[PDB]
Design a protein around this ligand. Structure first.
Ligand SMILES: N[C@]12C[C@H]3C[C@H](C[C@H](C3)C1)C2
Ligand code: NA
Lengths: 74, 74, 74
């Protein structure tokens, strides 16, 4: 089962990275707006999106730990 | 030795992810306070915690590089 | 070819982590300046560097997905 589960975990990783990429693009657009017209409001929104992006990174790292455990059987 | 070292590196990864999770929870609480009562002070604290969270992510990635090197022997 | 490609991907990972580390050091220095003399300008620069650091993390994760695919052949 170990090889087949690895393949599934790799597909989960690809899905999560797609989600991370879309988040990163939103974050960068936020930073461009902030650099153009800085304000408290823009700053909070920018931070919100940075936090969200870190949260998704942690989810991606969780999947990599599951990949590492699956490997460390075989 | 390669298989046994891999198992140890996997335990190190699990420990570091526990630390990252606790950090993420602190960061999210900071963002909730910031969104409630935005101020310069809240903003700096929020950034401090975001930076700290990135620093731990880099430590987690270091461990994954060590896992990748251990794998690439066998 | 799978073993040799893995070795190459591991070297790519080491290069990218060197780049991430240098970024992290810049980000931390930014945060020290911000904590010393907080201002809107310092805040935007700090966020800029945090965003940049997340962007490099995503590139590092891309390489780890390529390492996971290379493994999941063998
Ligand atoms: N074999 C591994 C490939 C990839 C990098 C590292 C951790 C995970 C994901 C398993 C080694
Ligand atoms: Na920020």
């Amino acid at each position: 089962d170990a090889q087949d589960k690895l393949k599934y975990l790799v597909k989960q990783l690809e899905r999560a990275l797609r989600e991370l990429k879309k988040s990163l693009d939103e974050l960068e657009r936020s930073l461009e707006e902030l650099e153009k017209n800085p304000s408290e409001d823009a700053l909070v929104e920018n931070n919100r999106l940075n936090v969200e992006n870190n949260k998704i990174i942690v989810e991606v790292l969780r999947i990599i730990l599951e990949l590492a455990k699956a490997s460390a059987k075989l």
